[PDB]
Amino acid sequence: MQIILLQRIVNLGKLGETVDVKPGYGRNFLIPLGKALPATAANIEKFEA
Amino acid sequence: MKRTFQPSVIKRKRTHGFRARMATKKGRQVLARRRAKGRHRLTV
Amino acid sequence: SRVCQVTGKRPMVGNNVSHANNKTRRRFLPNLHHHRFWVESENRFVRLRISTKGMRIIDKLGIDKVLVDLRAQGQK
RNA sequence: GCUUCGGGGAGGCGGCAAUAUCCUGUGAUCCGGAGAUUUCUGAAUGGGGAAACCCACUUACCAUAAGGUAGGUAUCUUGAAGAAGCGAACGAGGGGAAGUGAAACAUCUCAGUACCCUUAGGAAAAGACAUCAAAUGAGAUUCCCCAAGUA
RNA sequence: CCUGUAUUCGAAACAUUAGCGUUAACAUAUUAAGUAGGGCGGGACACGAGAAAUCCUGUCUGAAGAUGGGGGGACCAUCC
RNA sequence: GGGUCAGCGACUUAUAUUCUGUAGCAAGGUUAACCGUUUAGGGGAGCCGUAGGGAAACCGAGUCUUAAUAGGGCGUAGUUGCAGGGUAUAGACCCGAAACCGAGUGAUCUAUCCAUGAGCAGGUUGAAAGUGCCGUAACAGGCACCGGAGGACCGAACCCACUGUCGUUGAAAAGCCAGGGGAUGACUUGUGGAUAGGGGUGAAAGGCUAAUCAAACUCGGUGAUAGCUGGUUCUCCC
RNA sequence: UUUAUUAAAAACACAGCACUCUGCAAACACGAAAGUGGACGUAUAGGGUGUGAUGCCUGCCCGGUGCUGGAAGGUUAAUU
RNA sequence: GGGUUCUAACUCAGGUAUAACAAUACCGAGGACAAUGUAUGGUGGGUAGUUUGACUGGGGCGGUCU
């Protein structure tokens, strides 16, 4: 899963950087608890703006 | 000799009733077969 | 029933085939699992009985797209 | 059995099955089109039930008594309109045997047949090439005769 | 001889069929990704795994996307 | 095997193929589906024959094998209709299984269970407990009274079925008579309900599950199959 | 208690004994699943098996087949 | 290349609220285990379909089958 970081978290990357995570990690923790967003054009534009 | 048959209208009506036949989908098929054959007495 | 909503997968029929080539009727059941999908557009968890391919479709297309597809399909 | 609109012109009130009272040129009986009435059970649908039964609620009106008249009150789907149930064969789809044959029998056959389930229409399905062909190429689908009991 | 046959024929009313006109219900894609293909297990193809092409999918996967892709009965190249 | 008589009763139909007879054409014969104001006429796709050899390529009155050109193997009047004999696929000359499979109907009989009611004349026997007295250091123990337990006893109703006779085309598809067992309990019985077939239930006999049980009944597959039994109808000639 | 309808018995059952399983969403059973009985019970409880009041008792054998425990070594599927 | 820990998937036939079942929300208890889908080895008369030859001074047993 390609995902944009919404905050610093260890061993993955910086704020706003796009990482690849395991689908379970991305789907069950980060996105539901508001630490990242799915990697789409409409979300990268939202974050950059 | 209590013989095989011993009539009781209440049990007969519950077991072979028109309403009991309608309740189950299969029994409606039996009733429809009686109607198709042309039998005058559909149910007891 | 044991049917995947997103993709409509349902039990398949087939044959158990022995080494002597004896055939017996068998079923192939979908990998159905209960999963609570987080939906931001409604700020809530929606529980679906979904297949693994269904979860992959959630991953690829988005819970919003799949949910609107189900609502168009009917039961919601 | 009633009303109306047409036909018809001398008998008629269905049959076993006649009798009696009667009707009929003021057009009867009879035939065709339309309309009205259409008890109760039955999808039955106000609730229930051992079908042709029991018990109701409510709106309006009437009666003054212990009621009558005309309605409304099932469930589901869609956003007030639909659906339910029944009934030949054919179509499409979801499941799907065994007797039998092989001179036994398990691969195989029977056969995707019998049967169960779902669901339409006068048909259904399919249908236009991400199809064949390798001939000078043809040009959707469906059905018939060959190819051929051949590969 | 009677009812008939050949022949010519009637409709107040209603149904049905076709043509035309009009209405209100629905539909009206814009070129196609969890798709083609692939591993495992099955099914259908006259074809019983067979050297087995082609189609469907329960499971796990998964492109190119016209400078591309499918088929032409394993498979490769050329060709159509 | 047949009581007798009368009626019904068993080699068929469709297609494919081989041989024979007959008819038309004849190195040619014939069309199928279809069109058709439809038995005519059209429709030449297709089929058989006319050439065979070899697995095949390939060759061809030849060809295969072989180094061989030797040797050897195989080779050097039909067709379309009609009729008949046979064969192949279909039920296939007729009748006849015990069986297997699918879907339904059955617990009004019977097996167990659930809920709710009812029944057990009459007469006996006398457990625990209890009371009182004696007695014990207290215990214990003894006697009398009282008490009414028991899958307790005798014995009707009720339930059952151990013996014998009768009956055996019975009064009865399981009985009658004379005796017999239990008879306050693991009892009997009324009503309603629940368990359904490779399933149920079973104090267990493979017992019962509607006079049917080592796998109920009805319909369907089904005209199951039967190298087996039975039958197979007019006449004469070789 | 039993073979309704040729067998009522030494057969079945029985109280009692023993082994074994089950820590509860128990084991076990019906069912495709849900849902049930077990049980609105809890190791003095429940299931299965054998024996069958009571008195005295219940000897030897783990080689075979089961069951319990162990993995040092050999062999071993898909998959890769 | 194995373990330990965590929770956020998943489970509860645990408590509270929701009239009751269920679901849901929170808490609590587990927890990448359990369980289920596909594939796969073992076991499996619990259940099915079947086989288990012939000659023979009847059959079986013995003997024989070229």
Side-chain angles (χ1 to χ4, degrees), chain A residues 7-43:
Chain A
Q7 63 154 100
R8 280 268 319 273
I9 62 170
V10 298
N11 297 115
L12 210 51
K14 293 306 169 267
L15 182 63
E17 192 275 8
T18 287
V19 308
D20 187 10
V21 308
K22 267 152 167 208
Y25 190 27
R27 184 221 311 171
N28 290 318
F29 200 76
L30 298 177
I31 297 169
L33 311 189
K35 294 181 176 67
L37 294 174
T40 57
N43 290 318

Side-chain angles (χ1 to χ4, degrees), chain C residues 11-23:
Chain C
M12 221 175 78
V13 294
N15 290 318
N16 272 333
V17 192
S18 75
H19 161 275
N21 189 359
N22 309 109
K23 298 291 180 68

Side-chain angles (χ1 to χ4, degrees), chain C residues 26-31 33-36 47:
Chain C
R26 76 159 279 185
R27 294 175 101 222
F28 290 89
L29 304 175
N31 202 4
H33 296 280
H34 293 17
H35 194 81
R36 314 181 321 111
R47 174 161 261 161

Side-chain angles (χ1 to χ4, degrees), chain B residues 5-44:
Chain B
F5 182 41
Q6 300 297 351
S8 164
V9 305
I10 192 66
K11 187 268 183 181
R12 176 168 193 86
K13 275 312 181 153
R14 290 181 173 180
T15 187
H16 312 302
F18 184 101
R19 293 189 52 87
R21 289 276 196 264
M22 301 285 298
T24 63
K25 181 266 289 181
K26 296 298 188 298
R28 294 151 151 261
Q29 304 175 10
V30 169
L31 262 173
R33 264 186 265 110
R34 311 278 292 195
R35 303 231 180 80
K37 194 153 151 83
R39 286 186 169 266
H40 290 58
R41 186 269 309 186
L42 318 186
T43 51
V44 301

Side-chain angles (χ1 to χ4, degrees), chain A residues 27, chain C residues 1-8 31-39 42 44-59 62-71 73-74:
Chain A
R27 184 221 311 171
Chain C
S1 190
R2 204 181 291 290
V3 172
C4 189
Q5 294 179 357
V6 298
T7 300
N31 202 4
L32 291 181
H33 296 280
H34 293 17
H35 194 81
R36 314 181 321 111
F37 292 95
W38 173 242
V39 193
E42 293 83 3
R44 65 182 180 179
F45 282 90
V46 178
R47 174 161 261 161
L48 271 43
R49 200 183 167 178
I50 195 161
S51 172
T52 300
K53 187 190 171 176
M55 221 165 288
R56 284 171 51 101
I57 285 181
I58 300 299
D59 276 342
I63 188 60
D64 193 28
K65 274 292 321 193
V66 176
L67 272 185
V68 66
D69 292 326
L70 281 71
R71 254 171 280 280
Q73 180 256 300

